[PDB]
Scaffold this active site. Structure first.
Site, mmCIF file in Angstrom:
data_model
loop_
_atom_site.group_PDB
_atom_site.id
_atom_site.type_symbol
_atom_site.label_atom_id
_atom_site.label_comp_id
_atom_site.label_asym_id
_atom_site.label_seq_id
_atom_site.Cartn_x
_atom_site.Cartn_y
_atom_site.Cartn_z
ATOM 1 C CG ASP C 33 -0.243 -0.070 2.532
ATOM 2 O OD1 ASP C 33 0.563 -1.004 2.720
ATOM 3 O OD2 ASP C 33 -0.487 0.797 3.399
ATOM 4 C CE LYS C 146 -1.196 1.312 6.609
ATOM 5 N NZ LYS C 146 0.005 1.769 5.868
ATOM 6 C CD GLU C 187 1.556 0.425 10.755
ATOM 7 O OE1 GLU C 187 0.767 0.448 9.788
ATOM 8 O OE2 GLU C 187 2.788 0.271 10.616
ATOM 9 C CD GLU C 189 6.709 2.081 12.212
ATOM 10 O OE1 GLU C 189 5.920 2.352 11.278
ATOM 11 O OE2 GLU C 189 7.908 1.762 12.023
ATOM 12 C CE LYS C 229 2.322 -3.177 9.290
ATOM 13 N NZ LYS C 229 2.147 -2.993 7.829
ATOM 14 C CB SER C 300 1.629 -6.633 8.429
ATOM 15 O OG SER C 300 1.055 -5.658 7.577
ATOM 16 C CE1 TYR C 356 31.034 1.752 24.011
ATOM 17 C CE2 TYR C 356 31.195 0.751 21.825
ATOM 18 C CZ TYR C 356 30.715 0.729 23.123
ATOM 19 O OH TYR C 356 29.941 -0.333 23.525
#
Lengths: 349, 4, 356, 357, 349, 4, 4, 4
Positions: C33, C146, C187, C189, C229, C300, C356
């Protein structure tokens, strides 16, 4: 957005181990923490003077039942006074319980208080100096605690305030307990009082439990180190419609599945005003429900384990063996029920 | 009360 | 305190069944998508002019891969344009997907927007006229949707506002979807950007998911008719500590066990910037984690399923078969991984002394 | 717990100056932002064809009314269509409004939508691409916006969800407007529908506004750069209890005092279904209420300012002057009312009759 | 969505009248409710031993100052002990206070306790049996109460949990108080500790007060029958930047205007670690701020009213008059400041 | 509608 | 993007 | 404390 560990790996392990021991397969909880006023009504029902010795004897009667209850009782909840009493052999009751494989619990709330501006709703008190109390109780043998919040189903209840406040107070009580190595049993009891049906109870139970778990999250509670003591989903006592046990189980398990994180170690059901048999049949049905249940589903019965025992005793020491026999029968029954292996021993139209 |  | 049934028993069954079909054992989701703005970068990376013809050929290439992907792909998420395009044989893309046993999904959010007063945080828009859109989408073959919310771990993020607002908007989106027979994939995220460790990500994830499920409850969402998701729980990209896949799995499953009610039908992990292999190995470890998982744990994936296929294609018509082969290989790998049966034969700059 | 200034001092000053100009002493807001659907019913009531030109002429009638209305109008709310139309004098309506000393406002919400799982409750949409729209409206002469949420008093409403969701969406909208130099008028309208009494309305109004201001705070909204458009506190339309204007004012001012921070620049009341005279009388009583009111208490009327004008016009070109004067008179009345100086000289109900029993 | 009046018109009137009397024009509050742990540190700073007699004498010293304080003191907050002590003439202290025109207040919280999972944050306890206690205190002469919550400004504080929990407990406390005819002073004190600047304090103060008033609303609190005791908005103690009194006043008044409903009867500022003169100057600047202030802006000072009196006394009865003089002077100074009528009294580069 |  |  |  910043982590400030409330517990160390070692503290978590201790709480987790304790929680798991209490609800281990086939095991449940004996709720013998009736308050001074509550236990008074008990002895009163059997025409027995409410003295300390009678209270101690009765408790001893339950706590010293033969070893057949050992595999049935993973925990025993006591009231302050009983925690400091001894059996006839001089052993402190907490020691008696552990010797039989049970974990010792202590009720720490101080009762319900009214919430101003609500339709007879309440919250619960008992947080003051609770940390120091838990530390002492831990030293004296207690590994878990109990705090009871009460919610009521009615036209305008439970209200948003009542739900939020009780959930928040349970979270506070839970936080303090875990800081002292005590596993908190979270009890958001929704009374069966009223004429609402199964659906209404399920709806309310789902709303209350979602609020409870969000509050526990907001307060940084370690779920693996807690137990939940909810009401089974049932119609109101005044409800005219009679439901099947399969329905009560389905509604109860569904409500829990939609609100209780799998991390919660166990669900120890309260039986409210259900008869001894009824409480066992429903628990059994709940355990045979076809849905996936990621937590132990067992009992935390008071009346449902004592009713017949208290009746058999009647205050007569000569009935000790008969009384304990009634208690044992219910422990065995419920031990099978929490495993879904319990089978009890035209006019219905 | 938790009994009744 | 009174119940006003959002859904009928019939509506519930439909949603629950669709949800279960998408994450049935061994099945996952192909996220194809990419918005016109995203797909542009994809075609660009392989020196391909971004024309509707090329976007269609590429989508056609993924959707028409041989039947080996059938038992691997339970759902396919599409962007608006693609939902109405057709394969060379004239068949509508959603029909192509259905004939292979997959459920058709449609992205309905309209991108992230900045939250004023925050340190670069956002919420997501797309609620306007969403009910009418879902009814039309349902009618045109889509069964799930979604919506993507984005949160970031930082010095003061995610903030209370960001967590509450994104959780609320996800709940609004889910409610409207369920009203139109569409299963919403929630979702939330949490980006891996930063140098925070695994514990920090796990903490934020637990807090975010707790807010998400409280919000879904407040908005009367039917969990059995939804999918989650989330991001896997991992250390930040610039983290200096080393971790095994088992640790990533333990942290991910632990976070989920502590917040996702058993009623949620499935968890379809996003893979972020992980390599195709990495995404498969982690999902595999997640399914092998000893803890009890009351929900399906699958995938997904967008880039994690398309990366090699995109390059293998390179806009060349003759690369159709080879490109499809790359996607097929990832489809099979992740189908095994979502069942914990993936075992292959086998870049840490932020772990070297250079960090570092 | 860390601040991330959503607005700079220059931006705050701009927003605060706009809000203060709108509700300056004696000034109110003309709400002429009826949608093509609502205006249709208006034009229809006077047997006038619902054409674009008729809508333009009608809005022209109001906006170009005699300069005697200038002191009464601090702001005019327009609908998208009208924002881009022009008066007969050639100037675009926004310029007309500004020339008369008024600030231009634009309705930006996209209507109410149902909240599933509730007893017919709603929330409001229109946030999508709102920033871009606000930026364009700003460039086109608009300095403030309007977004309306609707709450209903009933057996189980407004519910916790409806109150929280509407408060949150109002805050999102407010945030976007302020980012674009647009003063947002927050409108959490509690419908007067129902047979509830005054006390019930006051209670609900109090809970709603408290949720609104908590939400505004959570979203970092600059209160001095906002205005509130609430319902006056009144009994439900079907209430069988009679109340005086002083009681309505007392209940309204009390509710506001308990929930609206002094920082809010002004309250511009909606009049709901009140008659023109009734809306003015109540606004006057509110301003005469013997309690401390730290914010401007004025009007934001549509019907209460246009009823007589629409009627006097009747779609006839010849009635223009007479019509405009009707609007001018209600404007003058409310200009006095918003200062507590509206007390007409002279002497000083179906659900109250036995028929409501 | 349904109102269930927590208070009757008569109850509200009583609460409102009390609140107004306390902060009447030119009047403020004497905070003499130091806990024994705190009052012990005080007596220690003057070589005096912490005995009940010395404590009684010191309080007597303050409460029996000359009639010049009468128009400056609208209320006096006492610690439980003092509420039951008597002056050398045999009159209970609450009686002494009332005869001088003051309302008697009582501190009812039981101190702060740590919030697990936070960076040294706390909440406050004292709700247990608070209703019965208020009923008793009311009966014994008290008309208002004080409860102190403490929040801190740091890297990740005040956290969401701390803000929400503290606002909620203040609401519980306020609710219980109003049910017993006691006007609750809501004290959400944001400590000045730290190196944060003025802007940061104003930001935090605004978020905290917004939470407090939302909570009061959720708990059905009658604002007109309450008082707010917030910290003034100032930079942290470790902040290197020095601000003017006008800036402190503008930041303070602005924060209040954006969060406190005008229905709130009054704001009685705590002075924290500010010197006596400093506290008076800032209180004066706040009342001179060119912005609309719909509520009384006065004082609720302990140290800022006692510092000099304590030093002058030095535990010596021979210094009674001299000590009381110091107190009266600060009383007079702040009476003017709460009206914006006060006036203070090369090397600064 | 805002008129009625 | 969700890719990177 | 509240003094210092």
């Amino acid at each position: 957005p910043h982590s400030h560990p409330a517990l160390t790996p070692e503290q978590k392990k201790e709480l987790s181990d304790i929680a798991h021991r209490i609800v281990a397969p086939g095991k449940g909880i004996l709720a013998a923490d009736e308050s001074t006023g509550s236990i008074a009504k008990r002895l009163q029902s059997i025409g027995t003077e409410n003295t300390e010795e009678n209270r101690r004897f009765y408790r001893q009667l339950l706590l010293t039942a033969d070893d057949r209850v050992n595999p049935c009782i993973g925990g025993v909840i006591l009231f302050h006074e009983t925690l400091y009493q001894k059996a006839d052999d001089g052993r402190p009751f907490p020691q008696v319980i552990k010797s039989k494989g049970g974990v010792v619990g202590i009720k720490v709330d101080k009762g319900v208080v009214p919430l101003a501006g609500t339709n007879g709703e309440t919250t619960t008190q008992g947080l003051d100096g609770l940390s120091e109390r838990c530390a002492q109780y831990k030293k004296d043998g207690a590994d878990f605690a109990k705090w009871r919040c009460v919610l009521k189903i009615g036209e305008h209840t439970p209200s948003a305030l009542a739900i939020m406040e009780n959930a928040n107070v349970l979270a506070r009580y839970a936080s303090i307990c875990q800081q002292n190595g005590i596993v908190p049993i979270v009890e958001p009891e929704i009374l069966p009082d009223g004429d609402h049906d199964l659906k209404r109870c399920q709806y309310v139970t789902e709303k209350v439990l979602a609020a409870v778990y969000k509050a526990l999250s907001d307060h940084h509670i370690y779920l693996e180190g807690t137990l939940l003591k909810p009401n089974m989903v049932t119609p109101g006592h005044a409800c005219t419609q009679k439901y099947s046990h399969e329905e009560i189980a389905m509604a109860t398990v569904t409500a829990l599945r939609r609100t209780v994180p799998p991390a919660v170690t166990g669900v120890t059901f309260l039986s409210g005003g259900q008869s001894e048999e009824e409480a066992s049949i429903n628990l059994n049905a709940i355990n045979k429900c076809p849905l996936l249940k990621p937590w132990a589903l067992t009992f935390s019965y008071g009346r449902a384990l004592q009713a017949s025992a208290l009746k058999a005793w009647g205050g007569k020491k000569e009935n000790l063996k008969a009384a304990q026999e009634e208690y044992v029968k219910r422990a065995l029954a419920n031990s099978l029920a929490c495993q879904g292996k319990y089978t009890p021993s035209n006019h219905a139209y | 009360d938790e009994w009744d």
